[PDB]
Amino acid sequence: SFDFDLFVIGSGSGGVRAARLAGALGKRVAIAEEYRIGGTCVIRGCVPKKLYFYASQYAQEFSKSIGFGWKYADPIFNWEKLVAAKNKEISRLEGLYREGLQNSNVHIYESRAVFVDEHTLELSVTGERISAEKILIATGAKIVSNSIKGSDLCLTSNEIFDLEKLPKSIVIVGGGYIGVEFANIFHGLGVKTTLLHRGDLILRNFDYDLRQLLNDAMVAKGISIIYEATVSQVQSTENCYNVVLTNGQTICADRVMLATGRVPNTTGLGLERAGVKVNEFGAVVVDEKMTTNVSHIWAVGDVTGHIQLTPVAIHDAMCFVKNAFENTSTTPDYDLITTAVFSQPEIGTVGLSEEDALHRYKRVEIYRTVFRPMRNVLSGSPEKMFMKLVVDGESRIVVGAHVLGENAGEIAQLIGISLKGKLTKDIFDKTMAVHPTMSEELVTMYKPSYVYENGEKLD
Amino acid sequence: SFDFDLFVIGSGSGGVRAARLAGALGKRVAIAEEYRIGGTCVIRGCVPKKLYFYASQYAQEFSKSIGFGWKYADPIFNWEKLVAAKNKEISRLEGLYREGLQNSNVHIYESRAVFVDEHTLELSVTGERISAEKILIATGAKIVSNIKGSDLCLTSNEIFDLEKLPKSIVIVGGGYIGVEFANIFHGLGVKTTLLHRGDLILRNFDYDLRQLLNDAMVAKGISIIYEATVSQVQSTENCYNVVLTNGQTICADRVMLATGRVPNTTGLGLERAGVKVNEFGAVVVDEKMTTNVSHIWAVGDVTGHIQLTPVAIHDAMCFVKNAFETTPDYDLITTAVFSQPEIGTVGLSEEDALHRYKRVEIYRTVFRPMRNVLSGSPEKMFMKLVVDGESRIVVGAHVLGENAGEIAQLIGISLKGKLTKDIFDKTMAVHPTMSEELVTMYKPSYVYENGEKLD
Numbered sequence: 001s002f003d004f005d006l007f008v009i010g011s012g013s014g015g016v017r018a019a020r021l022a023g024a025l026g027k028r029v030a031i032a033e034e035y036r037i038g039g040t041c042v043i044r045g046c047v048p049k050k051l052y053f054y055a056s057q058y059a060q061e062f063s064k065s066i067g068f069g070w071k072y073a074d075p076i077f078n079w080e081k082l083v084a085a086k087n088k089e090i091s092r093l094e095g096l097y098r099e100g101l102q103n104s105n106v107h108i109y110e111s112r113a114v115f116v117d118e119h120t121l122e123l124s125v126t127g128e129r130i131s132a133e134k135i136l137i138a139t140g141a142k143i144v145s146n147s148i149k150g151s152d153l154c155l156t157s158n159e160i161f162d163l164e165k166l167p168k169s170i171v172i173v174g175g176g177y178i179g180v181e182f183a184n185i186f187h188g189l190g191v192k193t194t195l196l197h198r199g200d201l202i203l204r205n206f207d208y209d210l211r212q213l214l215n216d217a218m219v220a221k222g223i224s225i226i227y228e229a230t231v232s233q234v235q236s237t238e239n240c241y242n243v244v245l246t247n248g249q250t251i252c253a254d255r256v257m258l259a260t261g262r263v264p265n266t267t268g269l270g271l272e273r274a275g276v277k278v279n280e281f282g283a284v285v286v287d288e289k290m291t292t293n294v295s296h297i298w299a300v301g302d303v304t305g306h307i308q309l310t311p312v313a314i315h316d317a318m319c320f321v322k323n324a325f326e327n328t329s330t331t332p333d334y335d336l337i338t339t340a341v342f343s344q345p346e347i348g349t350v351g352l353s354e355e356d357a358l359h360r361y362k363r364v365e366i367y368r369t370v371f372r373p374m375r376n377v378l379s380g381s382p383e384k385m386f387m388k389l390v391v392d393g394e395s396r397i398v399v400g401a402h403v404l405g406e407n408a409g410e411i412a413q414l415i416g417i418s419l420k421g422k423l424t425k426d427i428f429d430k431t432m433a434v435h436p437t438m439s440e441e442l443v444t445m446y447k448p449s450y451v452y453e454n455g456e457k458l459d
Numbered sequence: 460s461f462d463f464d465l466f467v468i469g470s471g472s473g474g475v476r477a478a479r480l481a482g483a484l485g486k487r488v489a490i491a492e493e494y495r496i497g498g499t500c501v502i503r504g505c506v507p508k509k510l511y512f513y514a515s516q517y518a519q520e521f522s523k524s525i526g527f528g529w530k531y532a533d534p535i536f537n538w539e540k541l542v543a544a545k546n547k548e549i550s551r552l553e554g555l556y557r558e559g560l561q562n563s564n565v566h567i568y569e570s571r572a573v574f575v576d577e578h579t580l581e582l583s584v585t586g587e588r589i590s591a592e593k594i595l596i597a598t599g600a601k602i603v604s605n606i607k608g609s610d611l612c613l614t615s616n617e618i619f620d621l622e623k624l625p626k627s628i629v630i631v632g633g634g635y636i637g638v639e640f641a642n643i644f645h646g647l648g649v650k651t652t653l654l655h656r657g658d659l660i661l662r663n664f665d666y667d668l669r670q671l672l673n674d675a676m677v678a679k680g681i682s683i684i685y686e687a688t689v690s691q692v693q694s695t696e697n698c699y700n701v702v703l704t705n706g707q708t709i710c711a712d713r714v715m716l717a718t719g720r721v722p723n724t725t726g727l728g729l730e731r732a733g734v735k736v737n738e739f740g741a742v743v744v745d746e747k748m749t750t751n752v753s754h755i756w757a758v759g760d761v762t763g764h765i766q767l768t769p770v771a772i773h774d775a776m777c778f779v780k781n782a783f784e785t786t787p788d789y790d791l792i793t794t795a796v797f798s799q800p801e802i803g804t805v806g807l808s809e810e811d812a813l814h815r816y817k818r819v820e821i822y823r824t825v826f827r828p829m830r831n832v833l834s835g836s837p838e839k840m841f842m843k844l845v846v847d848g849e850s851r852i853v854v855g856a857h858v859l860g861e862n863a864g865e866i867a868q869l870i871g872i873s874l875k876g877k878l879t880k881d882i883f884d885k886t887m888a889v890h891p892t893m894s895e896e897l898v899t900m901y902k903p904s905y906v907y908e909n910g911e912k913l914d
C-alpha cells in the first residue's frame with residue numbers, strides 16, 4: 001500500500017491541472033512545489049510578461065491620441081508601482097491555484113521532491129519519504145547555464161520582473177521570443193535598449209516577413225540590434241556592466257539580461273533511480289499516452305521536450321488524466337499550434353511559413369497585405385498591420401497564416417480555428433466582411449499577391 | 460444607340476463598386492452623385508463614426524494606465540481638432556474614390572439624376588438628358604421623416620460637425636446608431652441620456668448582448684429611459700426641452716434623432732421608370748438584383764435589406780456578374796456595433812436557435828481581462844457559442860467587450876465553413892489572450908432539449 005494514488009512533481013501549468021483533476025476524481029493525490037504554486041507562467045512567465053507588455057504600451061498609445069484631439073502632460077512612469085501591482089496579481093492567482101488543489105483534497109508539499117526509487121520520493125526540506133502508486137513528472141524547464149565569463153553577473157527572466165529600479169540602459173542577450181518581448185518592454189518604458197543576437201535576424205523559425213518587419217520596426221524606433229554577436233564576457237564597472245563581444249565591440253549597460261533558451265528540468269531529479277529514460281536533449285521520453293518507459297511514471301509539459309507553451313502543458317495534463325485513469329487514449333495533438341509573440345509590434349502565427357510551404361507543396365499561393373489601420377491615419381503613427389495567408393494551390397487549403405501588428409495574437413488564435421478545420425481559401429473569400437475592421441482584409445484578398453510552382457516564384 | 464451602356468445613380472459603397480467594375484470591363488459607364496463621392500459610409504457613416512469612437516476611447520486608456528504605474532497625465536480633449544481631423548480624412552477618401560472612378564473611365568456627373576423615362580435620366584444641375592441601356596439605382600437610405608419640434612434636432616448627417624461639444628445630449632433611438640453615439644458622447648464627457656420606445660436596447664440582437672451593454676452603459680452613468688416616446692421638442696432659453704408622452708421632460712443642449720433609416724428615392728422620379736416600390740419605400744429586387752423593369756437593377760440600402768456597407772458591395776459584385784458577365788448570399792453575415800463595450804455577432808441568437816433545433820448546447824463565459832484586474836476597470840469580456848447538439852455545428856457566436864467586432868469577423872470565417880464545436884475544442888489555445896476562451900469551453904454552460912433549458 002502506497003501513501004498516495006498519485007504524486008505530482010511540480011505545480012506548474014501541467015502539474016496543477018493534472019493534480020486537481022485527479023483529486024476531483026476522488027484519488028488520493030500529493031503535489032510537490034519547491035518554489036511557488038502555479039509555476040513558471042503564473043509567477044514569472046506569460047502572466048507578468050503580459051502585464052509589463054501592457055504597461056510598456058501606454059506611452060505610444062497616448063501619442064496616438066493627439067491626432068484625435070487629445071492633449072496631455074508628458075507621461076511619467078513609476079516602476080515600483082508596476083512591480084507592486086504585478087506582485088499583488090500573481091499572489092492572487094497563486095492563491096487561487098492553491099485553493100483549487102485544496103478543494104480537490106490534494107496535499108501540497110512545499111519542498112523539492114526527488115526520486116529515491118520507482119515508487120518513492122524524498123522531500124528535500126525535511127528528508128521525509130513519501131510513496132506513490134503513480135508518479136507524474138511535471139518539473140518544467142530551466143534556463144541554460146551560460147557558463148560566458150561573468151554570466152553570474154547577468155539577470156534572467158527569473159529576476160527581470162523584480163528590479164529595484166528601472167535601468168537607464170539594458171543589454172538583452174538573445175533574439176528569440178523572450179528577448180524580443182523584453183527589449184520592446186524596456187524600450188517602451190524609456191530604457192536605452194540593445195539586443196544581441198548570434199545569427200543574422202531575430203526570431204529564427206518564424207516566417208521571414210515576421211522576422212524582418214519586427215526587426216525593422218524595433219530599429220526604426222531606437223532599439224539597437226547587433227547581429228552575429230557572441231558574448232565573451234561581462235565585467236563589472238562602477239557605472240555599468242561592460243559586455244564584451246568576441247569581435248571586440250563592447251556595450252556598457254546598467255543591467256544585462258540573458259534570454260538564451262530553456263531546457264527540460266531533469267538534472268538532480270533522481271530519474272536514474274527510477275529508471276526513467278531521458279534523451280540527449282534532457283527531455284523525459286514519453287509515449288503517445290504521456291507514459292515514460294516505467295509503466296506507472298508519466299510526464300507532461302516542458303519537461304517532455306516539446307514546444308514550451310502553457311496551453312500545451314495543460315493539454316498534456318488532460319491527456320494524462322484520461323489515459324491513466326480511464327480506458328480511452330486521448331493522444332496529444334501538437335499539429336497547427338498557434339503561437340504569439342508579445343513584441344511591439346505583436347506577432348501571431350499558425351501553420352507553415354512561406355518558405356516551409358514552398359518546399360512542401362508543388363503549388364503555393366501567397367495572399368499578402370501590409371496596410372495602415374484606420375486609427376493610424378489620424379494619429380500619424382508609422383504602425384502597419386501585416387497579414388499573410390499561405391495556401392496550397394492544389395487543395396486550396398490555407399496551410400499557414402501570419403500576422404504582425406495590433407492584437408496579432410488574438411487574430412492568429414482565431415484564424416487558427418479555421419486552419420484546424422482545414423478550411424479552404426474559398427471559404428475565407430465567401431465570408432462577409434465586417435466594416436470597419438482590420439480583420440475584414442482577410443476575407444477580401446481575392447487575388448493572390450504571387451504564386452510558387454515547384455519552389456519557384458512566377459513573374 | 461444609347462449614351463452609356465450603364466448609368467449608376469449614387470456613388471456610395473454599392474454604386475461606386477458597380478461603376479468601377481463595369482468601367483474596368485470596357486463598358487461605357489456614367490455615375491451621378493448629388494452630394495459627395497463615396498457616399499454615406501465614407502462621408503457621414505461608418506468611417507467618421509469609427510473615428511469618433513476611437514477619439515472617445517482614449518479617455519479610458521488614460522484612466523487604465525494609472526494602475527500600471529503611469530502618473531495622471533491631465534488629458535484634455537478638443538472637439539474642434541477632431542472635427543478638422545475627420546474632415547481631412549473624409550476628403551482624402553473621397554478623392555481616392557473619385558480617382559478609382561476616373562481610373563475605370565467612369566464619366567462622373569456631379570448632380571442629382573432623375574428619371575425622365577425608362578432609359579433616360581435628367582441631371583438636375585444642368586438639365587442635360589442622358590440615355591442608358593442599363594441603369595443601376597444605388598441611392599442609399601435616408602433618415603425617417605419623424606414629433607413637433609423635430610426640426611430642432613440633429614441627425615447623424617449633422618452630428619459630426621457640431622460647432623462645439625455639448626454639455627449634455629439626448630439621443631432618441633436605441634438601435635445601433637443611437638447606442639454608438641451615446642457611448643461616443645459619454646466617453647467625451649457629455650451628460651448623456653438615451654431614449655428608447657421599447658423595453659431594451661438593440662432589438663434583434665442576442666439577449667445577452669442587449670442586456671450586458673445596457674447594464675454597462677447605465678453603470679457608467681448613461682441614463683437610459685425605456686418606454687419613452689417623444690411628444691415634442693421645445694426651444695427654451697438654456698436648452699432643448701424634450702417632452703415625452705408619459706409627461707417626463709428632459710432638458711439638454713442638443714437632441715439627436717437616431718430613429719431608423721429608410722430607402723432613399725427622394726427626387727429620383729421612379730414613377731417615370733416604371734419601377735415598383737413597396738410599402739416601406741424599398742426598390743423591390745429579385746434574386747439577381749433586378750427590378751420589375753428588366754434593364755433597371757438596384758443594390759444596397761435602397762433595396763430594403765440590411766443596411767451595411769459590405770452587403771452593398773456584395774450586391775454590386777453580383778449585379779455586375781449578372782448584368783455583364785449569381786445571387787447574393789445574405790446568410791451568416793457578421794455584424795459589429797461600436798458601442799462601448801463593443802459588440803460582435805454572427806449567426807443565430809440563443810433564442811432563435813433553441814426553437815430551430817432539438818438540442819442546443821450553450822457555451823457562455825463572462826470574465827475580467829487581466830488588463831482590467833490590474834487597472835481597476837469594471838469592463839468585462841463576454842463570449843457565447845450557440846451549438847446544434849445534433850450536428851455539432853457552431854450556429855451562432857456572440858461577443859461583447861474589447862475588439863468584439865474584430866473577433867466576430869474571424870469567428871465568422873469558421874462559421875461560414877460550418878466548423879463543429881469539436882474543431883474549436885481541438886484548436887490549441889494561445890496564451891495569454893482573450894480569444895483562447897473560445898477554444899477551451901469543453902463543457903456546456905447549459906443545454907436546451909426540445910426548447911426547454913435542462914437542470
Ligand SMILES: Cc1cc2nc3c(=O)[nH]c(=O)nc-3n(C[C@H](O)[C@H](O)[C@H](O)COP(=O)(O)OP(=O)(O)OC[C@H]3O[C@@H](n4cnc5c(N)ncnc54)[C@H](O)[C@@H]3O)c2cc1C
Binds near residue numbers: 009309
Ligand atoms: C519569461 C517567460 C515567458 C513565457 N511566456 C509564455 C507565453 O506567453 N505563452 C505560453 O504559452 N508560454 C509562455 N512561457 C512558457 C510557459 O511558462 C511554459 O511552457 C509553461 O510554464 C510550462 O508548464 P509546465 O507545467 O511544463 O512547467 P512549469 O510551469 O515551469 O512548472 C514546473 C514547476 O515545477 C517546480 N519544480 C521543478 N522541479 C521540482 C521538483 N523537483 N520538486 C518540486 N517542484 C519542482 C517549479 O518550481 C515549477 O513551479 C513563458 C516562459 C517564460 C520563462
Ligand SMILES: Cc1cc2nc3c(=O)[nH]c(=O)nc-3n(C[C@H](O)[C@H](O)[C@H](O)COP(=O)(O)OP(=O)(O)OC[C@H]3O[C@@H](n4cnc5c(N)ncnc54)[C@H](O)[C@@H]3O)c2cc1C
Binds near residue numbers: 504636
Ligand atoms: C451613422 C451611420 C453609421 C454607419 N455605420 C456603419 C458601419 O459601421 N458598418 C457598416 O457596414 N455600415 C454602416 N452604416 C451603413 C452604411 O453607411 C450603408 O449601409 C452604406 O453606405 C450603403 O451603401 P449604398 O451604396 O446602398 O448607399 P450610400 O452609401 O448611402 O450611397 C448613396 C449615394 O447616392 C447619392 N444619391 C441619392 N440619390 C441620388 C440621386 N437621385 N442622384 C444622384 N445621387 C444620389 C447619395 O448622395 C449617396 O452618396 C452606417 C450608416 C450610418 C448612417
Ligand SMILES: [Cl-]
Binds near residue numbers: 016017020
Ligand atoms: Cl488548472
Ligand SMILES: [Cl-]
Binds near residue numbers: 206353355356
Ligand atoms: Cl518564410
Ligand SMILES: [Cl-]
Binds near residue numbers: 476
Ligand atoms: Cl469600390
Ligand SMILES: [Cl-]
Binds near residue numbers: 666667808809
Ligand atoms: Cl437570445
